[model samples]
Target: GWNAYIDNLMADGTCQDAAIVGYKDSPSVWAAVPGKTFVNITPAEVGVLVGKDRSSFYVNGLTLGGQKCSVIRDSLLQDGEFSMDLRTKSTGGAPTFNVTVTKTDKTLVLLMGKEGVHGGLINKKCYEMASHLRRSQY
Candidate 1:
């Protein structure tokens, strides 16, 4: 399933690298080189570091207009519940949007809000997109 989703993104030329945040060793965000796998590092010592064959973790995958986006796992605050906020930029100087993911109980809620008039549309679109992705995958 992971291969299928990643392969589709690669075929569409939209899988522009991946990022890992809230990892164990490196708490800050670490990004993978463009068009490079996140297994090993070459010039930059950046990659997703996690123990092998571990459970009691979470991994969420999503797509933004064909671009492969995901969260590998949660941070150390994975006791009862936890949340994280991230801002992403594209060919710009600073971040443009904010994305937040919160886990309460057994449900995970994702929110993307900003100072814009398209809040309603964005929320609706995200719900529809996530629904579609889930149906397609599972």
Candidate 2:
């Protein structure tokens, strides 16, 4: 199941990257508006890494003036339910939550908890790329 999810995520193959297009809030809850991928998602874009190995997972958040990837956490492994927990922000609030590739949909439903990002994590950079897309729109 995990492998299936991984393969589903990295459709191009291993060592690929995906943009955090949006995020969800819970493992099971009512559909929320947070899943909509927006321009840059936030002031700083998030980086999600999916490596060749199933156990390989790394995430880095972009800071305004600090280290480009100042906040980085690696070695994130999934549980038996084909789900993993990613702590994106500080623990002051619901920064961490259970995420899963519950279905084979292109749009991701990652549960990023309260005020967390609901990203797409696709093949796009999702940084300036999203901005460019938004700006270049006619």
Candidate 3:
């Protein structure tokens, strides 16, 4: 089901780029967030590519700051939301990263956070521009 969702986005060329908008929850909170986008990355690169029979979703290459990252969501389409545990392979000494996605107003709200001594929240909302809808406000 998750693969189908992502595949549809790719099939229609809607996955060309993803607009990232969110904030970092930490000291000096409510910071004016900087915008980011996934560039030159294919839907397959960021969606399920391997172990489809055993995995709900698998991300092989998600680039951030010129570094590649991977993610695995073992249980998607359960409890009306999906979550993943992420790790940065290119950038060493990164904190434990986790992301949760839920649909609201027809958009996908991506709540990302870190776990560790220096970890904090890096909340983001990924809008489906083609649908012109928004996700979770928080």
- Give the Cα lDDT of each candidate: 0.34, 0.28, 0.33
Residue 114 of model 2, lDDT score: 30
How many clashes in each candidate?
Answer: 0, 12, 0
Ranking by TM-score: 3, 1, 2
Per-residue alpha-carbon lDDT of candidate 2 for residues 1-138, written as tens digits (9 for 90 to 100)? 223333333343331222223322222212222223222233222223222333323333432112122223232223322223333344454334222222111223222223333433321222223233334440
Model 1 Cα lDDT, one tens digit per residue, 1-138? 334333432343323333222333433333323444332322222121133322322343333323233434343135533443333333345434444443332222244444332433333433343344435541
> Residue 6 deviation, candidate 3, in Å?
24
Which scores higher on lDDT, 1 or 3? 1
Return whichever of 1 and 2 wins on lDDT: 1
Best by TM-score: 3
RMSD of each: 11.5, 15.2, 13.4
Model 2: lDDT equals 0.28
Q: Is candidate 2 or candidate 3 better by TM-score?
A: 3
How many steric clashes does model 3 contain? 0
